[PDB]
Design a protein around this ligand. Sequence first.
Ligand SMILES: Nc1nc2c(ncn2[C@@H]2O[C@H](COP(=O)(O)OP(=O)(O)OP(=O)(O)O)[C@@H](O)[C@H]2O)c(=O)[nH]1
Ligand SMILES: [Mg+2]
Ligand SMILES: [Mg+2]
Ligand SMILES: [Mg+2]
Ligand SMILES: [Mg+2]
Ligand SMILES: [Mg+2]
Ligand SMILES: [Mg+2]
Ligand SMILES: [Mg+2]
Ligand SMILES: [Mg+2]
Ligand SMILES: [Mg+2]
Ligand SMILES: [Mg+2]
Ligand SMILES: [Mg+2]
Ligand SMILES: [Mg+2]
Ligand SMILES: [Mg+2]
Ligand SMILES: [Mg+2]
Ligand SMILES: [Mg+2]
Ligand SMILES: [Mg+2]
Ligand SMILES: [Mg+2]
Ligand SMILES: [Mg+2]
Ligand SMILES: [Mg+2]
Ligand SMILES: [Mg+2]
Ligand SMILES: [Mg+2]
Ligand SMILES: [Mg+2]
Ligand SMILES: [Mg+2]
Ligand SMILES: [Mg+2]
Ligand SMILES: [Mg+2]
Ligand SMILES: [Mg+2]
Ligand SMILES: [Mg+2]
Ligand SMILES: [Mg+2]
Ligand SMILES: [Mg+2]
Ligand SMILES: [Mg+2]
Ligand SMILES: [Mg+2]
Ligand SMILES: [Mg+2]
Ligand SMILES: [Mg+2]
Ligand SMILES: [Mg+2]
Ligand SMILES: [Mg+2]
Ligand SMILES: [Mg+2]
Ligand SMILES: [Mg+2]
Ligand SMILES: [Mg+2]
Ligand SMILES: [Mg+2]
Ligand SMILES: [Mg+2]
Ligand SMILES: [Mg+2]
Ligand SMILES: [Mg+2]
Ligand SMILES: [Mg+2]
Ligand SMILES: [Mg+2]
Ligand SMILES: [Mg+2]
Ligand SMILES: [Mg+2]
Ligand SMILES: [Mg+2]
Ligand SMILES: [Mg+2]
Ligand SMILES: [Mg+2]
Ligand SMILES: [Mg+2]
Ligand SMILES: [Mg+2]
Ligand SMILES: [Mg+2]
Ligand SMILES: [Mg+2]
Ligand SMILES: [Mg+2]
Ligand SMILES: [Mg+2]
Ligand SMILES: [Mg+2]
Ligand SMILES: [Mg+2]
Ligand SMILES: [Mg+2]
Ligand SMILES: [Mg+2]
Ligand SMILES: [Mg+2]
Ligand SMILES: [Mg+2]
Ligand SMILES: [Mg+2]
Ligand SMILES: [Mg+2]
Ligand SMILES: [Mg+2]
Ligand SMILES: [Mg+2]
Ligand SMILES: [Mg+2]
Ligand SMILES: [Mg+2]
Ligand SMILES: [Mg+2]
Ligand SMILES: [Mg+2]
Ligand SMILES: [Mg+2]
Ligand SMILES: [Mg+2]
Ligand SMILES: [Mg+2]
Ligand SMILES: [Mg+2]
Ligand SMILES: [Mg+2]
Ligand SMILES: [Mg+2]
Ligand SMILES: [Mg+2]
Ligand SMILES: [Mg+2]
Ligand SMILES: [Mg+2]
Ligand SMILES: [Mg+2]
Ligand SMILES: [Mg+2]
Ligand SMILES: [Mg+2]
Ligand SMILES: [Mg+2]
Ligand SMILES: [Mg+2]
Ligand SMILES: [Mg+2]
Ligand SMILES: [Mg+2]
Ligand SMILES: [Mg+2]
Ligand SMILES: [Mg+2]
Ligand SMILES: [Mg+2]
Ligand SMILES: [Mg+2]
Ligand SMILES: [Mg+2]
Ligand SMILES: [Mg+2]
Ligand SMILES: [Mg+2]
Lengths: 393, 82, 205, 85, 60
Amino acid sequence: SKEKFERTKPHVNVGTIGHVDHGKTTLTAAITTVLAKTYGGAARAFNQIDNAPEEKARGITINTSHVEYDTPTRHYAHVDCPGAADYVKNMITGAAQMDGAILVVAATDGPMPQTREHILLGRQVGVPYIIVFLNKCDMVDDEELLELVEMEVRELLSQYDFPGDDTPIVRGSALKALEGDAEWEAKILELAGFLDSYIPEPERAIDKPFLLPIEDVFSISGRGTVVTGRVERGIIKVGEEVEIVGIKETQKSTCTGVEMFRKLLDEGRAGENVGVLLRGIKREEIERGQVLAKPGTIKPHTKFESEVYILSKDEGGRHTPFFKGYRPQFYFRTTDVTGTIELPEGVEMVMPGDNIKMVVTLIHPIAMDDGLRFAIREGGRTVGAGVVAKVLS
Amino acid sequence: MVTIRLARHGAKKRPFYQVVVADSRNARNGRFIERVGFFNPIASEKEEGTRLDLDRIAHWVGQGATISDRVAALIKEVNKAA
Amino acid sequence: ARYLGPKLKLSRREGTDLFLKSGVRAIDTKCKIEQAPGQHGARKPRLSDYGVQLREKQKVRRIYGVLERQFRNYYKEAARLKGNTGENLLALLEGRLDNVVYRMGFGATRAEARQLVSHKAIMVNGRVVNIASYQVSPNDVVSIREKAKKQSRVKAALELAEQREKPTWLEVDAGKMEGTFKRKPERSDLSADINEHLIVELYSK
Amino acid sequence: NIKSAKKRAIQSEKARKHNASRRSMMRTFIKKVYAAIEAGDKAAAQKAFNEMQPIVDRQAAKGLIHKNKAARHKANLTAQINKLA
Amino acid sequence: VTSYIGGEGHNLQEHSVILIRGGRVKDLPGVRYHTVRGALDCSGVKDRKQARSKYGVKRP
RNA sequence: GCCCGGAUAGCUCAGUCGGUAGAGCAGGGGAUUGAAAAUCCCCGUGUCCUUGGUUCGAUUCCGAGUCCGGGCACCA
RNA sequence: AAUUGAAGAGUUUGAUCAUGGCUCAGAUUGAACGCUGGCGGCAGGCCUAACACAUGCAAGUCGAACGGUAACAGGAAGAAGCUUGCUUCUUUGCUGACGAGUGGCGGACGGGUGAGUAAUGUCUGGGAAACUGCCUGAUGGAGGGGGAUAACUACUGGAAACGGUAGCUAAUACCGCAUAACGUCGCAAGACCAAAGAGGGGGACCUUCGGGCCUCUUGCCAUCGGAUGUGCCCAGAUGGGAUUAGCUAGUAGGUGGGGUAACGGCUCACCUAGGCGACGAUCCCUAGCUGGUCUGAGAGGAUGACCAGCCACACUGGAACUGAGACACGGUCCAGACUCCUACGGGAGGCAGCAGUGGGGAAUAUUGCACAAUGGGCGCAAGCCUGAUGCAGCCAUGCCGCGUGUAUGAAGAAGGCCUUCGGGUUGUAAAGUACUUUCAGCGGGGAGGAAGGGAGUAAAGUUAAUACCUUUGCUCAUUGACGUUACCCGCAGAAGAAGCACCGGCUAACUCCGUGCCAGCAGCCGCGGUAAUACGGAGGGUGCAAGCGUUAAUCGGAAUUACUGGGCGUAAAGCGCACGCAGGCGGUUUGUUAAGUCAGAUGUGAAAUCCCCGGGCUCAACCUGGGAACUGCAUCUGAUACUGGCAA
Ligand SMILES: Nc1nc2c(ncn2[C@@H]2O[C@H](COP(=O)(O)OP(=O)(O)OP(=O)(O)O)[C@@H](O)[C@H]2O)c(=O)[nH]1
Ligand SMILES: [Mg+2]
Ligand SMILES: [Mg+2]
Ligand SMILES: [Mg+2]
Ligand SMILES: [Mg+2]
Ligand SMILES: [Mg+2]
Ligand SMILES: [Mg+2]
Ligand SMILES: [Mg+2]
Ligand SMILES: [Mg+2]
Ligand SMILES: [Mg+2]
Ligand SMILES: [Mg+2]
Ligand SMILES: [Mg+2]
Ligand SMILES: [Mg+2]
Ligand SMILES: [Mg+2]
Ligand SMILES: [Mg+2]
Ligand SMILES: [Mg+2]
Ligand SMILES: [Mg+2]
Ligand SMILES: [Mg+2]
Ligand SMILES: [Mg+2]
Ligand SMILES: [Mg+2]
Ligand SMILES: [Mg+2]
Ligand SMILES: [Mg+2]
Ligand SMILES: [Mg+2]
Ligand SMILES: [Mg+2]
Ligand SMILES: [Mg+2]
Ligand SMILES: [Mg+2]
Ligand SMILES: [Mg+2]
Ligand SMILES: [Mg+2]
Ligand SMILES: [Mg+2]
Ligand SMILES: [Mg+2]
Ligand SMILES: [Mg+2]
Ligand SMILES: [Mg+2]
Ligand SMILES: [Mg+2]
Ligand SMILES: [Mg+2]
Ligand SMILES: [Mg+2]
Ligand SMILES: [Mg+2]
Ligand SMILES: [Mg+2]
Ligand SMILES: [Mg+2]
Ligand SMILES: [Mg+2]
Ligand SMILES: [Mg+2]
Ligand SMILES: [Mg+2]
Ligand SMILES: [Mg+2]
Ligand SMILES: [Mg+2]
Ligand SMILES: [Mg+2]
Ligand SMILES: [Mg+2]
Ligand SMILES: [Mg+2]
Ligand SMILES: [Mg+2]
Ligand SMILES: [Mg+2]
Ligand SMILES: [Mg+2]
Ligand SMILES: [Mg+2]
Ligand SMILES: [Mg+2]
Ligand SMILES: [Mg+2]
Ligand SMILES: [Mg+2]
Ligand SMILES: [Mg+2]
Ligand SMILES: [Mg+2]
Ligand SMILES: [Mg+2]
Ligand SMILES: [Mg+2]
Ligand SMILES: [Mg+2]
Ligand SMILES: [Mg+2]
Ligand SMILES: [Mg+2]
Ligand SMILES: [Mg+2]
Ligand SMILES: [Mg+2]
Ligand SMILES: [Mg+2]
Ligand SMILES: [Mg+2]
Ligand SMILES: [Mg+2]
Ligand SMILES: [Mg+2]
Ligand SMILES: [Mg+2]
Ligand SMILES: [Mg+2]
Ligand SMILES: [Mg+2]
Ligand SMILES: [Mg+2]
Ligand SMILES: [Mg+2]
Ligand SMILES: [Mg+2]
Ligand SMILES: [Mg+2]
Ligand SMILES: [Mg+2]
Ligand SMILES: [Mg+2]
Ligand SMILES: [Mg+2]
Ligand SMILES: [Mg+2]
Ligand SMILES: [Mg+2]
Ligand SMILES: [Mg+2]
Ligand SMILES: [Mg+2]
Ligand SMILES: [Mg+2]
Ligand SMILES: [Mg+2]
Ligand SMILES: [Mg+2]
Ligand SMILES: [Mg+2]
Ligand SMILES: [Mg+2]
Ligand SMILES: [Mg+2]
Ligand SMILES: [Mg+2]
Ligand SMILES: [Mg+2]
Ligand SMILES: [Mg+2]
Ligand SMILES: [Mg+2]
Ligand SMILES: [Mg+2]
Ligand SMILES: [Mg+2]
Ligand SMILES: [Mg+2]
C-alpha cells in the first residue's frame, strides 16, 4: 500500500481452469516470469503464488491465489482456483469473477473427469469465453500422438455449448518456459496474443447502483478488516456510506480505502477486483457470503419465487423425482446456502429435465433482485440453474 | 517568565478571555498569581465589553513581566487621556 | 413535545373544562362530559391521597401543555424563588409565550396559539420568537408581523376575546393586532378554581 | 532516535570529555594539599594552596563548579592549614 | 452460576454464548441471575406482542 | 478457506457390522379429590440431527448440509 | 442581594402491640443492555490488559554566531556564439536565500497515565541552612592572545548503521595572560576570581582604500535586587486488620573528617546503647492525594471520571552524564525480556503523546482540517513549528429547546370491542371544508469572531545631519481553518416527521377470550388446581414520552452502627465473681494561671464547582460579572465564670 494505481488500459478478469496435478500454478508462474522480462512488468515467482503448510506438505492448491500482470494493450488480473474435488465451493468464487478463462488440458493424459465438471460449472455461473492450453507436450516426443488430444478437447466444448473448433488451442510446456528457453518462452508470449485477440473488452456496468459480493475476508494488522471481491456494478468512492447486507443481519459502515493488489484507488469502478477497508468492524461478525451495497437499494430476503430449470442425465443433473422437503445447495453470487423447496398447487412431483417455478425457503437471509441467477448443486455434482421471478420475504 | 496574557474560557464559538498574570511555562488555563479583568470580542455597542485594572499592570510591568500581543492592544484601547 | 391526540378525552378524565377544544364555538356539550373518561366511565373512583395529588398535577399540565421533565424543572425554579411556592408555579406557567398569546386573543385555542408562536408570526420587543416556553418578563410588547397580520385565522379568533373574561394584567389594542404585556400575573386575578396546594405536596417527597 | 536534535548527544559527549578533564585536574590540586596535610609545615601546604586557589575560582566562574563549592573548598581547607600548621 | 431463562420457549442447548443480567427469581433456591433474551445467541421468544423489551422481540 | 469429531422418543441410555427401532424413568387417559400424591385400571407418547443416493427394503451402507465442538493456516 | 428545611408503605400473626430483618417509592452515573428513533444548542466519550503494536504524525529554531558565495535563484565586471543584446558563460556576500555538520538557546514545558506509594507522598499552618535560565531594577566593567576542531579535500573500513588516517579553516563552542571590587576567604593584613561581539546608517577627519572613527540597536561578563520557581524541615490531619506484639544495628545520639546549591547517618571514623511502640511501631491487604463531585434537612455517608493544584511513572531493572534546573515520555550507557532488519560481521526501536490495530471486555470515536485567533518554543522582524489548542466527523452518552399540524366538523358515518341486543364504547377520534409553512428541501442577500502585519506619507524623538533608526497620526492594498457560517428574505405545499413500560395491593389504570399448580410471571406480598384484574392474546385505560424501560452502581428512606439520634429483666445484648495497673472521671474554699474555653484582631482558606443577585446565546441547559461562601488554620491581644496545672 503506497503507489497509486493509475487507470490506464482496460481491466480484464482472467482465471485458469483444470484437473488436479494437470498444470495450473506452473502455467500462471510461467506467465508471471515471461511477461515480466520482455514487456517489462513486475517479476514475482512460483513460490509466492501457492504457500503455507497446507499447500506444501501435499503440494496442491486449496485457496484462490491471485496475480496481477500487464501487457501492452490490456491489464490482467489472474486467479488460480484449487481444481480438486473437495474444494469446489471456493473454486466457484474465483470462477464467478472470471470473464475469459484459460482451460488446461495435458497432452500426456488428455481429458479427465473434473475437466468436464469445471466447464459444466462455468456456463451456469458466467464464463462467456474460454482458451485451452496443452500443458505438457515435451513429455511425448511424437507429432501424431499429441494432435489426437487436440481433437478430444474440441469435442468437450462443442458437446457442452461452445464454439469448439474456433477456440485457440495453444501448446507448450510451463516448466521449460519458467526457467528460460527461447523457443518455449516465445510460445507463451503467443498465448498472451490470443488473450488480446480472442477475448473481447468486457462491457462493464457504470451507471446502476453500487454492489460488491465478498469472495474472502482479510484482517490487516493496523488498519482493520478488509473485504475482497469484484465490483459487480456501479462505482465506489473513498468516503461514501456502505450498508452491509447478507447473512446474519444488516450493518452500516463507511469505505475507508479501496485498493487493487496493494496499490491505492479513489474510484474503484465495476469489473475490477478490489479490496475495500471498512470502518470499525471486526473479523468475526463479517462473514464470507455477505454483500456491500449502497444504503436503501437492496434488501435481505429468505423466500423467493424462481423459474428453475432442472437438468437431466443428458446435460448433467438428476435422474429421479423429488417431493417437497428436498434441501440442496444454492450458489447465488459467491457462497452456498441450503433451502427447502415448496412446489405450486396442481404439481405432484418434479421430473428431471423440466421447466417449472418454485418457492424456495432459505435457512439464512441473502440479498437478491428480480433478474439474478444461480446454480444448484448437491452430492458432489450439479442439479440445475435458474432465474429469480419475484421477491416474497 | 511571568506574563500578562489571555486564558481563553467560555463555550464553543463564544469565547471569553480571562486576562491573567501567570508564568510562561505554565499552561494556557494553568496556574496564575492573580487575574486582572477580562476581554470579550462579541459585546457590540452596549453597556459592558472589556475590563483592565491599570493599577495591577503598573505593579507587574514595573517589577518585570511581558505583555502579550493582544493585551498590548487593550492598554492602547483604554488610553491615557483619549 | 406535545400531546397530539384526542384532546376532548382529557377534559372528561379530570371533569372540568380545560379550554382545549374551545375555538370559535363557545361551549361544547357534544362529548358526554364528566361521566366518560374511557370505556369504563360508569365506574366511580375511590381515589387515594396519591390520586388527588396526581390528578391535580395532571390537570394543570394539560391546561398549559407542559410535559413532566419540563414541568419538574419549573417546580425546581419555584422552590429557589422567594415567597409562596404555590403562587410561583402558576406565575411561571402564565409567563409562557404561547399562554400569553392565548390570553391576548390571537389564537382561538391554546394549541393554535402554540403553533402561531412557533411559525414566526409572533414578535416581541422587535424580536421574532419561536419558543412556546419563552419566559416573558414584565413590561413587554408582543405583536404580530405584517405577513401574518390580518389573515384568516386571527380576526375570527380575536372576536372570541370579546366573550372571554379578559385579564387585568395585560392590554390589547385590537386595531393593528398589537399587544402590551403590562405586569406580572397575580394569583387572585386568574384561576379561582384549580388547586396549587396539592401539586406542591407531590414533588416535596 | 528519530530526530535531528540528536546534536545534543554528540555535543554533551564532546562536552563531558572537556568537562571531566578540568574536573579531575581541579581535585588533584586539592589532593596535593591533602598530601602536605598529616605531616607538613605551613609552607608545603601553603604553596600547594596558592596553586589551587586561582584554578578553583576560574572553575567556579565558568559554571562547572558552583561557587559555594569553591567557598567551602577554600574555607574548609584553610581550617586544616591554620589550625594544624 | 445458574441463570433462569425467561419466556415460553428458548434456543439454549449445552453451549451457546449468552448475556447474563442480575435479578433473583424468588422461587428456585439459589438461581440469582436472569438470562437476557435477544442478546447474542439466546434469540427472542416467538409471537410476543405485549412487553417486548423484555424477551427481545421486534415490531410486527 | 480446509481437517476432523458430536447428534437415537420429554430427559438418561442399549441398539448396528441390511429385515420395518428398544430399556428405565417420566408423561397422558379413566375411578377417587376442589386439584394433586399414593392406591386401582390402560397407553410409546419416535421427522432414528436434516436431506438425497446404492438397494425390493437403510437408524445401521455412501454423499451433501445444520449448529456446535476442537485443530491449522492466509494477511488489500 | 447572598440558605424558606426532616413524610412514609408493604412484609412474621386467626387477630394485636412490640422487636427486627427483607422489599419499594426519590435523587444520581464516564454506565451498559433490549425495544424504538426527527432536528438544533453545550458538554462529554477504554472504568477491563501500566497487555501487545504495523502505518503516518506530536520540537525545533535563527545568516541578528563565522567561515564558507559547499547546493539553489537573482543581479553585477567580463566572455562566446551570431536572430550584437538574442543566447553560451568565468568570476562576484552586493541582495534573495540556505546545507550531511560546528556553535547559542530550547527539548525538563506543553501533552498522557495512575503501575507503584499508607508517608519519603498529599492537605492545612509554620520554619532556616538554600539555589533560581531566559524576563527584569541598579552599579561597573565588556583586556588581549592561543590551540585545536567538525565541516572541507585526500587516501581508505563497511551491506547498513556508521567510521578511520593525514592534511587545511572560522567563531558568541574551548583555554591561559592583564584587570578588578560592597564578589570569595581570613580574627585581620592579604590572596584569589570574568567576558563576545554582532546588527543599520553616516559629516568632518582618516583611508596600507581591510576600513578606522561616530552613532543607535541588540548583544555580552561582576555584584546587592525583584519576581516567579525549585530543594529541604517540623506540627497536626490523611484507609482497613491485633486471627499482625514487639521491631530496629547506620539502628538512636555525639565528636572529627569527607560530601551536598544547602541542613542532616547524606556518608566513613571512633565514642555512647539508645530510638520507636497499646495516643497501634513492625508486618499483612487495599489505595495516587486534594479542590471538589454525588447524596443528605443537617451531622455525616459514599466517592475522587470530566475541569484545575501537587506527587509518581515513561518496554522491565539499574546507573550516571549534559545543563540554572533531569538522575531525563518521543536523550545517552549497560543488562534483561519482545518484536524487526542483515551481505550472519553486527545494527535498529519503544503509542500510559494523536489517530488506528489486535486482544481483553457488559461496554467508549476520525489513520480529518488549521495555524485565522488564544498562549508555547526559537526568532531584529517576514515568518516557521505545534495531534498544546481551535474546529469538523462519529455516538440519544448526558442536560435542554422546538417539532410531528391548527380551528370547524353528527350521518354521533364505517370498521373494532362489550352487551340487560334497548344500546353502550373506540370518538370530534376519522373523513371533509376553511387556513399556516418553525425545522427539514432549494435559491439569493449576509454580519461577528481580525487584534495586527506590508508599503507609502507628514510630524515628534534621535544625531554633526532635512539620511538610517524609535514613536505617532494618516492613505492604499490586504490577512478566516470553522464556511454551501450565525442571521435575513423569498419559493412550493398536510406535504418529510411516535414510540414502551405498566393496569391484584404497595402505586395512577378494566373487561373478554386462550390455558388449567401446566405453560408462565415477580421489586416485596404472592398469582395459575376449568368463570384468573397477577399467566398468553385481544380491545380499552394509566403514566412517561425522542425517549422509555431492564440491569448494576452510591447515598437516601435506615433513629437498621444511633455524636446530633438506639439499646442490654423476658425480643439480639450484663463478663460467673472479685482485686487492680495504664486509661476515663472526680467533693469543697481561697489564691495565682493562661493549656482547654470564650472574645476580638491579623494574614491565610488557589481558581473553577456550590449557594444569592445580575449580563449574554431568540429560550434553556451552557457561558459568564459581582459579592457572599471557603463551617477552617496559624499567630497576636484580652476575658477569666466553668475545665486543667501548681498552690493555701
Ligand atoms: N514436465 C512438465 N511437467 C509439468 C508441466 N506442467 C505441470 N507440470 C507438473 O505438474 C506440477 C504442477 O501441478 P499443478 O497443476 O500446479 O497442481 P494443482 O495446483 O493442484 O493443479 P489444479 O488442481 O489445476 O489447481 C509440477 O510439479 C510439474 O512437475 C509441463 O508442462 N511439463
Ligand atoms: Mg494451482
Ligand atoms: Mg500430488
Ligand atoms: Mg487547554
Ligand atoms: Mg511571550
Ligand atoms: Mg425533551
Ligand atoms: Mg540537526
Ligand atoms: Mg563522565
Ligand atoms: Mg587522576
Ligand atoms: Mg582517575
Ligand atoms: Mg584524586
Ligand atoms: Mg556551557
Ligand atoms: Mg370428581
Ligand atoms: Mg371444580
Ligand atoms: Mg410424581
Ligand atoms: Mg403423577
Ligand atoms: Mg410484620
Ligand atoms: Mg397470614
Ligand atoms: Mg512505531
Ligand atoms: Mg507535523
Ligand atoms: Mg513535519
Ligand atoms: Mg530543522
Ligand atoms: Mg532551518
Ligand atoms: Mg554558551
Ligand atoms: Mg508535568
Ligand atoms: Mg486530550
Ligand atoms: Mg486516553
Ligand atoms: Mg483523558
Ligand atoms: Mg538565603
Ligand atoms: Mg543557560
Ligand atoms: Mg580576542
Ligand atoms: Mg580570536
Ligand atoms: Mg600561549
Ligand atoms: Mg603549533
Ligand atoms: Mg600554528
Ligand atoms: Mg600525526
Ligand atoms: Mg591557522
Ligand atoms: Mg564562551
Ligand atoms: Mg563575604
Ligand atoms: Mg569576611
Ligand atoms: Mg575589617
Ligand atoms: Mg577586608
Ligand atoms: Mg575574551
Ligand atoms: Mg536577541
Ligand atoms: Mg542587551
Ligand atoms: Mg545577559
Ligand atoms: Mg530509653
Ligand atoms: Mg437523614
Ligand atoms: Mg481517563
Ligand atoms: Mg514536596
Ligand atoms: Mg530509565
Ligand atoms: Mg552539572
Ligand atoms: Mg522526573
Ligand atoms: Mg514515544
Ligand atoms: Mg525527551
Ligand atoms: Mg552518558
Ligand atoms: Mg492513542
Ligand atoms: Mg479496536
Ligand atoms: Mg505556517
Ligand atoms: Mg524569543
Ligand atoms: Mg523576539
Ligand atoms: Mg526577510
Ligand atoms: Mg514536527
Ligand atoms: Mg496536522
Ligand atoms: Mg494576534
Ligand atoms: Mg408482566
Ligand atoms: Mg377464563
Ligand atoms: Mg399482565
Ligand atoms: Mg443512617
Ligand atoms: Mg434497637
Ligand atoms: Mg427500648
Ligand atoms: Mg428465649
Ligand atoms: Mg435474651
Ligand atoms: Mg451478673
Ligand atoms: Mg469481655
Ligand atoms: Mg465483677
Ligand atoms: Mg472494684
Ligand atoms: Mg486505675
Ligand atoms: Mg486528671
Ligand atoms: Mg471539682
Ligand atoms: Mg496573665
Ligand atoms: Mg477565636
Ligand atoms: Mg498556598
Ligand atoms: Mg474558590
Ligand atoms: Mg448555579
Ligand atoms: Mg460566578
Ligand atoms: Mg467571579
Ligand atoms: Mg473581584
Ligand atoms: Mg484549631
Ligand atoms: Mg490556633
Ligand atoms: Mg495588659
Ligand atoms: Mg487574672
Ligand atoms: Mg482550678
